[PDB]
Ligand binder design. Structure first.
Ligand code: HEM
Ligand SMILES: [Ca+2]
Ligand SMILES: [Ca+2]
Ligand SMILES: [Fe+3]
Ligand SMILES: [Fe+3]
Ligand SMILES: [Fe+3]
Ligand SMILES: [Fe+3]
Ligand SMILES: [Fe+3]
Ligand SMILES: [Zn+2]
Ligand SMILES: [Zn+2]
Ligand SMILES: [Zn+2]
Ligand SMILES: [Zn+2]
Ligand SMILES: [Zn+2]
Length: 319
C-alpha cells in the first residue's frame, strides 16, 4: 500500500502510524536518539505487558498502565514509571490509537534507534484496557531467581526467554534503585544494543557507585555503572548462567531472540490473528557500534565464570 505522503507499508491500515512515528521520533526520542525516553519507553512495554496472570488477572499488553495510571503507578514495582506515563499520555490523546498499541509502538520505534538494535514485530489494533493490573506482578530487583522465573513463567516465559528479554538492560539505567545517582546505566554502552550488559554483570563486583545499602542493588565493577541484585543472581544461578554467558559476543542471538521474545511480550493478553501486522513501519536500526570487550584494565580473571559446561570466551580489554 502507498500512504497519502508516499511512504509505503504492506497493509494500508498501517498508514496511520507514519505521523505517529514522526511525532514520537522528534518529541519523545529527541530526534530519533537511543536515550532516556527510549529506555523508559522500553521499560514501560514490560511494566504494561507483564500485568498478566491466568490465576490473578490483568490484561497484559493492554495500555492499562496508562488508562489506570492512578492505580498502577503507585505499585512499588512501578517506581519512577509515572514520568514516562505522563510523557506518553498526551501522544495517546492526540493520535488515534489505543494506549496498548501506543506503548508497544513507542517501544519498538525507540529500540530501532539504538545501534545494534532490532525491529520488534509490531501489530496494530489492541482494544482499550478494561481492568487494571493487579499489584505484585512486576519482578523487583530484590526478588530471588526462583521468584522471578516463577512470575515470568506464570506469564508464559521460560527461563531462557527471561535471559533473552534482559538484553533490554543493555540500553537501560536506574533512577530509583539509588536515588543519589539517578541515570546510572546497567552497562557501559546504554546507547548501544550490545552484549556489554552480559559481560559486565559477570565481572566480580568492586564498589557501590553511590551509597552502599540500597535494596535490590549489588556491587558494580565500574564507577559509572549500577548492578541489580537480580542481574547479579541471574548471571550466576545454575538455572540461567549458561544462557547468560551464551549471549556474550553473540550479537545475532541477542538480536533474534530479543525481537522474537519482545513480540511475544507485546502480545500478552492479545490475539495476533485479530490484529494487523505493521512491522514494516518500524525504522531500520543502525548496525552495532563497537565489539564485545572487557573494560580497560580488566582481564579474564575478573570474570566470575558460572557456566560449568563452557568456559567464558576470551575477550580482549579496552586499551
Ligand atoms: C526479569 C526481571 C527484571 C527486573 C527485576 C528488572 C528490574 C529493573 C530495575 C530495578 C530497573 C531500574 C528502575 C529504576 O530504578 O529507575 C530497570 C530498568 C529497566 N528495565 Fe528492567 N527488570 C527486569 C526485566 C526487564 C525486562 C523483561 C525488560 C524489557 C523491556 C526491562 C527493561 C528495562 C529497561 C529498558 C530499563 C531502563 C529504564 C530507564 O533507563 O529508566 N526490564 N529494570
Ligand atoms: Ca497492562
Ligand atoms: Ca549496551
Ligand atoms: Fe488516569
Ligand atoms: Fe481511543
Ligand atoms: Fe478509546
Ligand atoms: Fe526518572
Ligand atoms: Fe568500554
Ligand atoms: Zn529527552
Ligand atoms: Zn526520565
Ligand atoms: Zn523521562
Ligand atoms: Zn494522529
Ligand atoms: Zn537457583
Amino acid at each position: 500500500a502507498t500512504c497519502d505522503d508516499g511512504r509505503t507499508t504492506a497493509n494500508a491500515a498501517c498508514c496511520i502510524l507514519f505521523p505517529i512515528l514522526d511525532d514520537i521520533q522528534e518529541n519523545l526520542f529527541d530526534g530519533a536518539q537511543c536515550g532516556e525516553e527510549v529506555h523508559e519507553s522500553l521499560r514501560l512495554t514490560f511494566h504494561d505487558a507483564i500485568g498478566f496472570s491466568p490465576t490473578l488477572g490483568g490484561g497484559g499488553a493492554d495500555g492499562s498502565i496508562i488508562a489506570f495510571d492512578t492505580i498502577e503507578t503507585n505499585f512499588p514495582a512501578n517506581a519512577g514509571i509515572d514520568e514516562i506515563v505522563s510523557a506518553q499520555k498526551p501522544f495517546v490523546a492526540k493520535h488515534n490509537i489505543s494506549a496498548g498499541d501506543f506503548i508497544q509502538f513507542a517501544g519498538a520505534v525507540g529500540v530501532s534507534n539504538c545501534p545494534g538494535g532490532v525491529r520488534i514485530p509490531f501489530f496494530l489494533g489492541r482494544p482499550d484496557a478494561v481492568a487494571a493490573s493487579p499489584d505484585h506482578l512486576v519482578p523487583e530487583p530484590q526478588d530471588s531467581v526462583d521468584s522471578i522465573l516463577a512470575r515470568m513463567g506464570d506469564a508464559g516465559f521460560s527461563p531462557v526467554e527471561v535471559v533473552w528479554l534482559l538484553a533490554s538492560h543493555s540500553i537501560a539505567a536506574a533512577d530509583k534503585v539509588d536515588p543519589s545517582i539517578p541515570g546510572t546505566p546497567f552497562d557501559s554502552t546504554p546507547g548501544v544494543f550490545d552484549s556489554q550488559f552480559f559481560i559486565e554483570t559477570q565481572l566480580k563486583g568492586r564498589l557501590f557507585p553511590g551509597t552502599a545499602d540500597n535494596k535490590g542493588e549489588a556491587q558494580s565493577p565500574l564507577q559509572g555503572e549500577i548492578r541489580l541484585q537480580s542481574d547479579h543472581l541471574l548471571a550466576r544461578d545454575p538455572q540461567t548462567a549458561c544462557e547468560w554467558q551464551s549471549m556474550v559476543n553473540n550479537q545475532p542471538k541477542i538480536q533474534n531472540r530479543f525481537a522474537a521474545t519482545m513480540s511475544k511480550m507485546a502480545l500478552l493478553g492479545q490475539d495476533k490473528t485479530k490484529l494487523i501486522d505493521c512491522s514494516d513501519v518500524i525504522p531500520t536500526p543502525p548496525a552495532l557500534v563497537g565489539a564485545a570487550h572487557l573494560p580497560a584494565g580488566f582481564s579474564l580473571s575478573d570474570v566470575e565464570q558460572a557456566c560449568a559446561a563452557t568456559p567464558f570466551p576470551a575477550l580482549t580489554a579496552d586499551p
